[model samples]
Target: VNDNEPIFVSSPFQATVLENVPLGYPVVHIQAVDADSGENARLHYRLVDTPTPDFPFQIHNSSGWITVCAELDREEVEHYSFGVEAVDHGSPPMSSSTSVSITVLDVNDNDPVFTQPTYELRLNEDAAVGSSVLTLQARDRDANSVITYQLTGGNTRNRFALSSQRGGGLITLALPLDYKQEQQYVLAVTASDGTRSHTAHVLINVTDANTHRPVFQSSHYTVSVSEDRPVGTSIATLSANDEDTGENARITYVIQDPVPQFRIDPDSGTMYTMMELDYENQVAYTLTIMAQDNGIPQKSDTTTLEILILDANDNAPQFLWDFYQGSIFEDAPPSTSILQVSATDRDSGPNGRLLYTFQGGDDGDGDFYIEPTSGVIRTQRRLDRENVAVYNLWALAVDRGSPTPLSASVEIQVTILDIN
Candidate 1:
């Protein structure tokens, strides 16, 4: 001690230590700085207040490394406060103290616990594909309290899907459910947190509902028939289905086709030709038929019918002109025929036989007659321009094909020139 010289001492006499430390995984490092330099600047650290058994944390005096030497029981003491001292090795040791308040951080080690061990859900089979069946909740006690949900068994992958919310809740769907194929289904669900997972077997029972209507595999059909075919010839077949049970699944058919030339069998969905087929009149015929289910609220679908015609020589050749006109003088010979009417047929052989007759004009007065076989018209009475100025008559032709017959008609006109 040189009393004669001015004394030089460290200005700040106190040092501060950290107040608190985190509890779990306590690999902590702490440091302190001295305000004074030289031999009086040496700093030493120590735990002034020991941690309790519940808060079993340790600190190295020389290295200032704090660690958890033993397990901490959070239930016993959720938080721990410790006192630490930092001393400068001066002539008289200058010491500073601080209190550390450590808050125990929670961990997600606990398994998620479901509000209900088992959940029950009831859904209709007719429910829409993505309709929600039930919701599930799980709880956890940990730092990151996050939970996830998944559907486990009972055809969950193929039939149902799961939707989970952020706060440990989930929704389930009735799995493998089909109203017509089966009445009901069962499914299982599981819940999980990030750390630990838990399972809750959920039973989802599906009820029966009218979900689907009658459907036709195809909406259109093509049928071929010969011209002038018979009335009851089966042209095409039809089919329909209903995705329900019992009478609700039953389907019936009826002709909704606008064409009056066709009819459908109600039970068999068989289309039959009703009237004669005329390709020249109409090449194609479209018909619509409905298939209705026998449900409480009946449902139905329609199908189109395309009727195509096949060529056949069943029609007779039509007359180009209805009536042919000619004039003859009354002074001409008695054998004179004013006009000759002829008929034609499209069918071959006698099946296309032609016949002639006086269809109109004074036939009872025996003004005209025609050969039945030859289709030729001739005057039966003497012609006089004064008695009968004009004459009109008709001729006919017939075809005698098996199963279907055909016919044609022709007309003749006659005028007599006045003679002096």
Candidate 2:
């Protein structure tokens, strides 16, 4: 049976198929018309392929409809070329075939999946703002594969930001961080391809960084401790604080200046007596104490401690001169001051005060008098050089402390000169 073949009206037709499209939908309508008359003019469509256990495309036998037999994924195959045949119902069937090229259009069907679900990162507490922390990566299953990243939650005081690039982005510090302010963060990052998204978890740990030096509460301090205080007595306490947190925030106290009489506690900042105090030897003690943090590249600060040592009754008054001598005219008038002297005590306050008095004098009848507060020697009556040109006297030096008062002796030699 000899028959004329049907012609493919549109041979080598170009069509389009959307990637990730649902099955059972036609990609394009394939048409063919028979050049024969009446019954021979009617045509039918058929599909052909290297048949295997499964096939992905087919055509309607009567409608010339090129339909997808299974799901389409551009990730696997972006373009497909297949043959379509048009046949006529005749005694001897005629057929014509055309190659159809299908270019799959991209569709957002695959969810972005991250290569890793968990990321570990460490940042310095003193990290500068806008510094890059890390880079995030993800993949999509579409031909035009692209994704956007977002970092959310677990940011310390909202201090982290993200910038998008190359289907992903970089994580950066939006604001400064301090180990004292925060220690750890658990963040959630998302990678999205418009219609679908993937989430990954990131753990950010803040490490210790020495950002601040220890600062003293006061620049200078003044203290008054009794000079007679027992050994090991606490006289003053210095306080200081650091801005750092964790181990970096720990502070240690020490004396920057050497004061053998004083000792400081490193942890408590308490200054105590290294020995018994006596103001007779030292009136005051001054020192510099420093506070520092026990961290790498340690930081520190110092303060001046001015200790005003309080007084105690510890010494008796003594004459400035061990032996005192003075002269006046034998004709000196009554109440005339013959001698004046000064004495001092090592003790302070009442204990350091001096009261002078004449203890003994070689006078048939006492003629020399002394002032109580001031050591002044005056003649009670007119003197005669012939009778008392040389007079020997002794004075007592005493303090106003316990009336069981301590005292010292002074030798006084008085002389007289004849008026010329």
Candidate 3:
């Protein structure tokens, strides 16, 4: 009998398979031939030496078939190289050796991972539209993966946008940001590699900015105060409101038109009298007031404040003439008319009502009488020219005011003419 070593049909074998293939899946088949008789012609296939430990590939002992013995992953190992040998069941066991290479094709199995699970970023409230706020990064372990990013949730107002980039996405402001209405937001971003997807969260915080003007409670204010009030008395309190943080919310009151009798506290918005007010001099005051906020490029609002000064009994009555001179005949009968006296009071209402009367005791023989309401000098009895040639009398003017009555006196000279 002739003896011959088993010769392989294909010296080197190559095969390709998908990653994550199930066990016992066929990869490739091998064959060998022996020229010698009977036992030498029969071929059996087996792995040669198993150089690599725990390899996923195995060869059949009889049929020369290569199959997967264990699970395969392309991420862990892309290709496998091993040797397969075909042996005949003979007395000496003739064998032929061959090399095999198996390549693993990648499938979309792993999900994309974000560098950070949650990201926080701050942007100005006055940030312009389309301004970039931050960038998000994600990585996929799969080979030749094209990652697409999009905003998936938490965009109810359409205030934010996402743009896809090489390795991540760019986040930008799509609409206006307002600190007064909304200050913070949480956004969900999704990254997809065609078949698989991953989600991440971004905490976007809107920072404070001075963007509001101070507003007064009322556009026009009217108040009444007594003119007799002492100086430094609080007359009115002003108020304003602002919708901003820090120094922007702080308000300062200002009087645009300066008045000598009034002054205002800037921080407290309290108005005080700098000097005593006189109703006789001025009855009302109109002040222009402005409320300003302490912020960059300060904002302000203007309003009108009308202060009505109440009247006080500060003025006295005075006669129109300093002195009066009248002549009456001695033969004049009782109730004879004489020159009239007039007086005026500077006070208002009842304080300005005046009454005329004789000052004191009767003048010269007690013959002259003055009318209380009309201030006309009349003869009570009879005026005699021989009894008294000239009479010096004083006339009084009184104002009917409560608590106190103010009076002014005027001297009058009367000459009685002798009856012819």
Candidate 4:
């Protein structure tokens, strides 16, 4: 009997076999029945459309056992539907046929694709971490798919992190925060979907922002000074710094506390005493100063000035030999060391060293010399009284000192010896 015909068993018992089978897997059992003797009837199966000509399936005409002789290729035939006839091999070999439908399921086997391969972003240096830099989008044909994101290997971990949106997107830090120790940092970011990961690079360049102010290394500076000094002598230097970029890092100094006795060099930060110091009057001074920076936020610092006064040779030297007398022949050499007169001074250095000058003199041209350091007087030019017989001259000695010079005076008389 043909496998496509319907068969009747006992009184009105008749059955037909449905067709269709998935390519590689065994048949999914639903329900089967026979119409022959209570237990004597049976069903069998075979492939009407085999995946390959050599791989046809066959079933025992009695026991209903189905088997395949060769492997099936799902690509060639993903699903198979056919007509299976059931026969009661016993009497008339009557058979019945039925149709079956088979469907093929799909598996996840494709990699993810990115819409844009690369992206870029700019961020200020002051931006904190966890701030959203940008978002990435990826899609999949599969419904209700879940996605996850991650950063690249070289990316800064402390400066950045990634979060996936509830739907399907990746959020990243726009600006990676770093210590002000460094000026800028370039960050490379990557986005991926858990199902299939994709790699895209982003360049996040950090821009500068002013966030710091100038600071002084110390709160106070103590300097020692001599009481006797010129009005504009530099006493001490002020220092400060700014932690910012470009012009913002530049700093300027000013004397916040102006002392009537002292003044500061605006451009140099050098503190100068404007008046002569009197140690007994004021030995020390407390001055205040401020340092400011050129920045948007404008930072500043403050410092104190501790000035101590010391002693110096401010007193003018006095001449030990205030007045003296000496004689010389009118006809003396052009320039000769006259009767040397010496003087002593209490002060030191140039303040004590003395030089002599002629106040009034006759019978001798203004001729004289004096040891500046030793206060010794000598004649600089010839003393000839042929023009006038008797000579009288007045000389003075002085020491170099500021404010005033110390002086001493001396008189000399000369008699002209006739060469007759």
Candidate 5:
């Protein structure tokens, strides 16, 4: 019988193995047949190191079985192939070769890594709802692993939200933003792969915008001022507030209806009188004060300011005529009416009430009596105009104002007619 070379079955074998498997794990079994008799038919296998010098697999000499000898890494080397030779025990040994290929399967052994450790972004406080704030990117070493994103910390009152779509980490606005309440936020973002996860930090800065109008402390303000105060005197100091930041919060005041008697400071909001005020002319003033902010597309508010002018004793009583004349008979009896005098004051309240009186002079000592309230002149006794031919007197009018009273006087002449 002639010694025949061993023929291989399944010349090329393909196998798949997960990475990180224990050493000496069976990979594939090699088989060959020999037609030779006895010792010549027995076959043994050994690996030939030609293609890969640093191979991680070995074949048994007697069993013709291949097993893993070294650690496997799918990321480092995904696929491996080696040649195996089968030999027969004969006086002249014959050998044949077969190829075995292994594919290293992926495993969930790596954690997801964020592209950046922290992301800083800015958003306007007036930004619309559902507006995109930012996008996040993460990477996982596993080929089939999926990364999930979440906002874990610093999401106060659920003001922000994350996208639910797979492989998308789009951050959007879920609630209204108020710069006056909060100015900045730090969010803890996480990317998870079911078993493994990584955390990242995201910082959000809320910028100022003209979203709030100026507001006054009171809708209506009532103040009383003296009319005797000089011009350029401070009447009231106005104040308004805005809930924004920087330029958006700065406020300026102005009078909506301008008047020559009043003025306001734009920066300090202080109101001053431009001219002297007369209580008799105008008792009260209704001013519309407007507060505006220094921002683009400015916002403003209006408030009613009521100013009450107090009365001041600045006017004196004046008689209607410079002089008065009256005629009485020489035989006129006592309590005979002579004449009446009238005067008026331009002030208000007690300052304008006039009290009529007779001036003290040498004119008719006790001959004439005048009524204080009615300003009527009458004879206290029998009038003797024949001895003096004429009688002269003075009528006085005084106001009942506080601190000081004002008075006006006019001369009155009485003539005696001849007895008929």
Candidate 6:
């Protein structure tokens, strides 16, 4: 009979044992078989290589029951790697080895604690950003762990930040200090050791400062105000600022003059009209502004604000009477200014300007023309009394205004004299 080689029933086996597990707990059951005749098929199982001396495992010769004999330390040596063999007792013994691996799983046994539980600091009212306020430590007993930091609640106003560096914590200013708004702050900081976390508190105080004067965005400002702008219209928004913090930075604005027509917002430095302005009456205004800080005695500064009034279409072209009687001989040469007409306007500039036309007249077909700006009427086609003894025509006056054109009738009339 042919005696065959012993074969491993379990090939390339794997097992796991929690760190410091009790004895008698099998990582996993390992077994093998040999296929042969008579005593050749009878398999003998044993661990060919038990881990070196002081190693912590055992296996029964015939039953192949592998068990932990001593305690396992994941911290010292996390895994055990070796080989198991199956042998057959034939005329010539046959043996085969299979590899086995053991891994030590970790347990949550370490507590993350802070080197200290509290931190305290103080700063000038105007400390620069990135200035280090304090540093803290978070230590974990486990060698495999590391510490990290975070800035959590109690950081009111987002005024502070924390950074994790070289197993410790760093704290810095996230915002400028303000004593009037906030005199003190307590920050909550957190440090983590992966599986667990520790918390620390930091307290900080601020000092008061009046290091700056109120300043305007511009020393001289000029703005245009339409004469037709309604009262309460905002002419400009003046911006005044202070570099100091809190109350020392607060600014109030005032228009130095007591005129009822203008006012400045004390809190916002906004300038608005209290009364409507008339360009014809007052073309421009030169104003003095005072900006004061809210510090004691209120530090102050001043600037010039020039308001120039712009004209609007507020007036209608004016004429002396509704109708007029005038003489123009029919024999007057063509294009001659016959009894030239005129009008007046109270509104200054384009708004009060006038244009004249013979549009609504009985001198219907090509008989008369008027100069637009001059308001002068001149003969167009030759005038003949034989064709018509009198004109009884209509004259119109228009003000150059988007204020409205929509034409007009006679708002006139004129007489024609005949020369036979």
Query: What TM-score would candidate 3 get against the native?
Result: 0.77
lDDT digits (tens) for residues 1-420 of candidate 6 = 546777666668888888757888777766766666678787777776643335688887777777889987776667788888878777778788888888878765676677776678788876987788988887775667777888876887887888889958888888877776788887777777766777777888887777578888899999999898898998899988887766777888888876888988899888889997887788889999988888764688899998999877776555666666566777678887765556676666666777777765554466777777676767787766677555666676677766564334453344557665
Root-mean-square deviation (CA) per prediction:
13.6, 5.2, 4.5, 11.8, 2.8, 18.9
Candidate 1 clashing pairs?
A: 19-100, 20-100, 20-101, 107-142, 107-143, 257-288
lDDT of each residue in 290-390, candidate 3, tens digit only: 89988887888888999999877778888889988888778888888668888988788878888887755344556777888888987777766556788
62-120 per-residue lDDT for model 4 (tens digits)? 54444443444333444555545555445445555555444333333344455667677
In model 2, where do residues sit more than 4 Å from their true spots? Answer: 1-3, 19-26, 37-44, 50-54, 69-71, 86-94, 144-146, 154-156, 275-281, 319-344, 357-370, 375-396, 402-405, 408-420
Per-residue error for 316 in candidate 6, Å, reads 0.4
lDDT (C-alpha, whole model) for all candidates: 0.65, 0.80, 0.84, 0.58, 0.85, 0.75
TM-score of each: 0.42, 0.76, 0.77, 0.48, 0.89, 0.49
lDDT of 2 by residue, 1-420 (tens): 325688776758788777756788877888876767766777878765512333467878778787888887676777776677777778777777878787878887788988876699888888899898988889987757678898866765888898989847798899888666778888788898877888888888888898989999899999998877898999888999888875566889989778789989999999899888887777778898889898888989999998888886767777789988888888777778877878888886778888887753343257788887878888887777777778887778778886356788777788888777
TM-score sort, best first: 5, 3, 2, 6, 4, 1
Residues 1-420 of candidate 1: C-alpha lDDT, one tens digit per residue: 111211213222222222233444444455566666764666667766644556466677766666776665443466676766767667766666666666555544478888876677677776776676667778776646678887777653466777778765445343446755644445566667755788777666766665678899898888788876887888888989887887777878987645678877888888888887775577787778899988777888998877888656566756656767777776666545665666566555554555555543334267666666665556666777767787665555555555665666655667778866
Q: Highest lDDT: which candidate?
A: 5
Score candidate 5 by TM-score against the native: 0.89
Q: What residue runs in model 5 are displaced by over 4 Å at the alpha carbon? A: 7-11, 35-38, 49-54, 219-222, 280-287, 304-306, 330-333, 359-363, 382-389, 416-420
lDDT of candidate 6?
0.75
Model 1 misplacement above 4 A:
1-113, 125-130, 139-148, 158-167, 172-186, 192-197, 207-213, 217-236, 242-249, 257-264, 271-287, 295-297, 306-420
Error of 1 at 23 (Å): 25
Q: Where does candidate 2 clash, by residue pair? A: none
Better of 5 and 6 by lDDT: 5
TM-score of 4: 0.48
Worst 10 residues of 2 by lDDT: 47-56
